[PDB]
Design a protein around this ligand. Structure first.
Ligand SMILES: CN(Cc1ccc2c(c1)OCO2)c1nc2c(cnn2C(C)(C)C)c(=O)[nH]1
Ligand SMILES: CN(Cc1ccc2c(c1)OCO2)c1nc2c(cnn2C(C)(C)C)c(=O)[nH]1
Ligand SMILES: [Cl-]
Ligand SMILES: [Cl-]
Lengths: 5, 125, 125, 5
């Protein structure tokens, strides 16, 4: 996997 | 919202599962006929990849058809390679099939495939 | 073949176009009812994202249903957030919705969402 | 974009 898009 | 988190692999995992549904013939809703060959697929995946299928399946009459016959000049192997690309992101481009793949991608209105075919052809000249 | 080339953005572009079809209600084939709320979607996208929808739409009787009613304990906003995640890879996870999103992801059998919810909850304790 | 996967 999860990220800040 | 602008506060979302994103799962990087989600889109590719969805596409992989759509291709698994296609292999098992689950919820396929159209047969594409290319000369003597038939290909089962999901209309939504075809529309999401191809300008031609988008135009076909947004038409008020053609959206209801369970069989679509392509132009007899379209090569079945070229179509098979492009259908596999739609469901996997992978294009099996080879010297022996590039002209058929490019012609099929022009017909299906798949500009990114047309672009890489033009680049590979230009590099050989 | 092992000689394929790959278009990196293909899977995300397909998902973006599937979400555009959903917004315009093009080729949607099921309505999911969550208490008083109705959500139109494509069965194949639901199956590709959710273990529960995969089981539902591979059943020989349920595969034909045009309406699916979820358990009354499922929160409609939680379901909406998860449906948006299915079609975009983006999860709108907030303090005010995390418990509903986690419970809905457990019910829908969406393990990656359950995992990030567990991690965010554990970080606050 | 195109790459060798
Ligand atoms: C694959 N196709 C792009 C495309 C390329 C050439 C064309 C075309 C569409 O129609 C005529 O010539 C596509 N576009 C979609 C979809 C949903 N919304 N949209 C747009 C038109 C709003 C971008 C979709 O499923 N697929
Ligand atoms: C989303 N789901 C994964 C999943 C998670 C938990 C489950 C489950 C399936 O069924 C019961 O519990 C999924 N799996 C698929 C699809 C196609 N093939 N497959 C597998 C089963 C061969 C991997 C698909 O469309 N979606
Ligand atoms: Cl393309
Ligand atoms: Cl998930």
């Amino acid at each position: 996997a999860w990220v800040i898009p | 919202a602008d506060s979302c988190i994103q799962f990087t692999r989600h889109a590719s995992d969805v596409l992989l599962n759509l291709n698994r549904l296609r292999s098992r013939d689950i919820l396929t809703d159209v047969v594409i006929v290319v000369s003597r060959e038939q290909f089962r697929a999901h209309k939504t995946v075809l529309m999401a990849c191809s300008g031609l299928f988008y135009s076909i399946f947004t038409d008020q009459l053609k959206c209801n058809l369970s069989v679509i016959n392509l132009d007899p000049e379209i090569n079945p192997e070229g179509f098979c390679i492009l259908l596999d690309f739609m469901y996997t992101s992978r294009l099996n481009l080879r010297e022996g099939n590039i002209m058929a793949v490019m012609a099929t991608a022009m017909y299906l209105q798949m500009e990114h495939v047309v672009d890489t075919c033009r680049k590979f052809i230009k590099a050989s000249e």
